[PDB]
Design a protein around this ligand. Sequence first.
Ligand code: MN
Ligand code: MN
Length: 692
Amino acid sequence: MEAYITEMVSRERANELEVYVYVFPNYEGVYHIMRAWQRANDLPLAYNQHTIMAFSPVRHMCGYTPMETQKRHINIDSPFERALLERLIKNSLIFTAERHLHAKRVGHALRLNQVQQIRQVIIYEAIELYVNIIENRISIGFHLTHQFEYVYTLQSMIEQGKTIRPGMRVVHSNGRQHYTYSTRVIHVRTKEQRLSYAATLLKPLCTFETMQPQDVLNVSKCIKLSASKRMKCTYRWIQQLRAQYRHLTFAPNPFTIAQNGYKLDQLSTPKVHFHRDYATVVSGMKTGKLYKGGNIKISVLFDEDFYLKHHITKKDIYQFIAVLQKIAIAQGVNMTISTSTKSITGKFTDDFFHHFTEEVEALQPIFAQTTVLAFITSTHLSNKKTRSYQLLKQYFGGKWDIASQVITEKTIEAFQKILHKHGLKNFYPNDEQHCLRVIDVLKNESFYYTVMNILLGVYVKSGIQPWILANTTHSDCFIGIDVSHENGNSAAGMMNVIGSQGHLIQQAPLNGILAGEKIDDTLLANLLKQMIKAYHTQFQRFPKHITIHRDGFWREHTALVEKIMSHYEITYDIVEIIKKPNRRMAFFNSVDNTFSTRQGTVYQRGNEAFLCATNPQQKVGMAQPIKIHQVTKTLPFSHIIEDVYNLSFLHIHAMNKMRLPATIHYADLSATAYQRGQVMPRSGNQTNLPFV
DNA sequence: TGAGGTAGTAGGTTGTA
DNA sequence: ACAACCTACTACCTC
Ligand SMILES: [Mn+2]
Ligand SMILES: [Mn+2]
């Protein structure tokens, strides 16, 4: 029942390692000299900014004379030598893995033999290794993944009667620098560049999108391993590598958390507020009323294809909606359908979805001041000829500020299939008697979260707060910052889950410049002042503390934050959230000799921690940890971890728990929606989440 | 696009005594 | 050039 992490700390120390340093007379310095020495002398090496470090003397120098040669230790007070030693240790590990163990260096990983073969698709194993120096100690971390390839090359396809597309993606698999694009010549293009070489080298690219069906099923079955198999296969190769490595020594069992220095904490599930205290969200939603009800005016957008290509009539659509209005009335929410849709009856045909741009302008007054319930076939939404989803969002959210919920034909087909399979198909809706039986039937199957998620989307897009946290957080205000790349121009977002119980109060785009992952000083100051003013508008006071959650690495300027929060006399903390730590944590059970994972587990060391926030099934995979880093110091770090974990139970748009806290999960979605132009910055309203 | 989860693929991207 | 995150897409199973 011990706690295991994919890391190990060496018995040796950073300044106890004897190394050889060569100093020679751009960041690409002494690299060709490194390659020459590597080929000539057959020993691991590393370089950093015109300096080479080795573990053994270099006999042959290939006619190169270093300015200085030294046999010394590292200066731990200088991070330069720390980085150089880290690179040397990683290179030595790679060198020792390639020999004695038959490993290749492919891409960014180490290809490790073949594990599966699925109808001319080869699956290899692979591993990543990382070296860090923390307080005169060396820590090695490692992560196991997979790799895909096709057996046949383009040479085997030019013959045997097979064709080639003019511009399909092909791969030239070489050593560590693989690209993406008889003995016939194949002309290929990359970026803006034309070239050609032998067809035997190139192979077709292996991705999920391009693989034929009946292959994705089995590939997914192989590459979705449980906790036990993943952890065992990860530790077996590292134990194999320890035998051949002798520059550093480790413990007999280096993989526990005591040997790594972490300490263990176990958090608890917060209480949620549905007009009372509820243990879980599901319990509150099944048998409880909302925290803040109200009235909703819904409208209907129905396309004729439901009747033309499928067998769904408008009567069935209104029968489905009548079920929604009956579940909602039991939660304090009253929904009414606008009657303006009758004047535009018979519209929304194929021609309408082909000339949407011309036809939508006169359709605005019908759907004004309502929450649209679009009923569109998935073909229209997906087809690139129409692209109806993007245009609908751009014209309803990006203009006219109208919230809309989209439903495809698959949901209605599943609902109708379940309706037929349980009888009671004769009548529904009116007379308010068959609706109760329909709800009773629905409540005992898996098609209950679909209806509830549709309802939750409607509520949240129409200004309703389903529930909040029943206990206030340690801090009084949370500000979440997120950015998106989108291959060039970058859109960002600063948002407020400020309330100690959980309430959107304001959202704000970081449209101005921002280049990439950098917020201008004036922009940051103005946004912080706007956020604090927005908090002053509510609660009629100022917060005693503020916590700033940042998606990624905190690359901003701390002096401005300190000055601004000192002007208003508020304490502040800055926390980095890392959602891809590339580490795995698990509990080992010796009685059954198996691995497991528990939600709300924290491994903390110094001002860094790993948090477990999800509980996936065996066939879904193994839980992904979250890395929490504290940049400043004003509160205990355990309080920071507890607040981060608590703020993730606020997935008010879905009954399924999200891994990340609300400050990040509602910021990335907002940034993504704003980048595509589905939200206008004129309003920036509170408690409304059209993008959610 | 009912939503979440995890896990492959391809590319940015900022800092470097 | 090396590290360590980030972005986007696709696929499946769960509720
Ligand atoms: Mn994001
Ligand atoms: Mn949605």
